[PDB]
């Protein structure tokens, strides 16, 4: 029993984190085989921030301008190249701790673990969701550039996020490991801001199923609704539309609990229209949308 | 910016987890130097559960009755002994991944990271607090016996918790690594139940400071209160008493924010008496008490 925001064990990723310094800028890199991946922002000066031309900035660099340190061991950079918003630093040494891995771009609504890192040293690990507006509500301080997000399936680490920057509302933006930004954000100084966000409906339903599996049943009711009628209420409360594919994905949880998805939707409609009346669900007084159906199955019986 | 339930990186502990089997019971053990620590419940049969005499059960065992597996490598047990509610299995091989470590018993109100494990394989990592009633609100399924809680300071892992059992309310009880239970719980079948719990006041104040550091200020007010008067309100709402030592511990956060502790106490009093009026603090609609002052300083600027 119990239900927590649970991250994947971080060991496999910890052994890949390195420190990358260029000029007076230090940030984190990811060392896999004989390549170190890091944010291309590492080649910028605080002066260049307005509208840097990274192709120019990079042509003016040499391998010896990049100091890469894996713990107490310096790695010799033997090649460099830019891929979108990341840098690929070829080093003379393959990481002996390289796990089986993949680079996988996630969807809004998906979750992942974040290994927050400073000066190449991991500091903490926590779970995040990619918001509908392609930001993440992370916890990052100065120096966290290059920290990575990932999931683990069996033995294989699927890297999905590399951290770049913090937006004015305190939320975070970054790239996939191919260097392509999540959302309409750029690695130069602008007034860019998080767009309007919505609540991830399928996840809220998954979390209600988790609550039922864990003995919180007070919000259940005898009613059922139609997908159409529920989506009318969802729109009104700034919730994402629920699709038949979502309903199908919730199948296993519906079967485990004996509660049809559209029955659970009737409970969510009530909760949206009346609130909780001072009660809580899984220790929360709000509807929690950062657990996927997979996360629930992973943690619940 | 940002504030999350953040666990310590789990790698150092992952390399210590092993599988221990005796009879048909399998659970997790902790392999440090040439000793494997695990719950003594591993020597029980479902028949013995009512009132086992563990000294008798252990005399009837031999080293060869304990199958210990570190991944794909079997460890040969060369000695066994009981220490309170844990077993110490001496093995022929010292763990080459043993980190610098300590066994440290924590106080109610303190937090720690949990590496939930099944069949010796780590599954997830999350943060927990030791409740005033000496339970923890964990997330554990069958097979999680022997999972460990820990903190990390610099390079040294301070192990503070080994998981044993789940109480009827779905909360969890276990021991320190010397095998001494936290709280009035025993490793035999009884009607034992979590005692009445309280809210960890110093932690709630720490979290309010985190909120201010992160730009949530709506709950602040011009008022200040006395320690005595605040503790009168605390008692009424089932909050722990606030001590001068707590006030001193909150010193650094008070100084960083410019908000005196007794001023923040006036805000908490208001929140207790009126609620939040539909607003949230750090993404929560409840007063969160599982962040210590240290946790806040660790994560905030
Ligand atoms: Br909440």
From Swiss-Prot, chains A, B:
Mutation effect (residue 145 to A): Complete loss of 3C-like proteinase nsp5 cleavage
Catalytic activity annotation: TSAVLQ-|-SGFRK-NH2 and SGVTFQ-|-GKFKK the two peptides corresponding to the two self-cleavage sites of the SARS 3C-like proteinase are the two most reactive peptide substrates. The enzyme exhibits a strong preference for substrates containing Gln at P1 position and Leu at P2 position
Residue intervals on the Cytoplasmic side: 1-301
Activity modulation notes: Inhibited by pyridone-containing alpha-ketoamides compounds 13a and 13b. In turn, alpha-ketoamide 13b (tert-butyl (1-((S)-1-(((S)-4-(benzylamino)-3,4-dioxo-1-((S)-2-oxopyrrolidin-3-yl)butan-2-yl)amino)-3-cyclopropyl-1-oxopropan-2-yl)-2-oxo-1,2-dihydropyridin-3-yl)carbamate) inhibits SARS-CoV-2 replication in human lung cells. Inhibited ex vivo by michael acceptor inhibitor N3. Inhibited ex vivo by compound 11a and 11b.
Active-site residues, Swiss-Prot/TrEMBL: 41 (for 3cl-pro activity), 145 (for 3cl-pro activity)
Sequence position, cross-link Glycyl lysine isopeptide (Lys-Gly) (interchain with G-Cter in ubiquitin): 5, 90
Functional note: Cleaves the C-terminus of replicase polyprotein at 11 sites. Recognizes substrates containing the core sequence [ILMVF]-Q-|-[SGACN]. Cleaves and inactivates human TRMT1, preventing tRNA guanine(26)-dimethylation of tRNAs. May cleave human NLRP1 in lung epithelial cells, thereby activating the NLRP1 inflammasome pathway. May cleave human GSDMD, triggering alternative GSDME-mediated epithelial cell death upon activation of the NLRP1 inflammasome, which may enhance the release interleukins 1B, 6, 16 and 18. Also able to bind an ADP-ribose-1''-phosphate (ADRP).
The name this protein goes by in its record: 3C-like proteinase nsp5
Residue window of the full protein shown: 3264 to 3564 of 4405
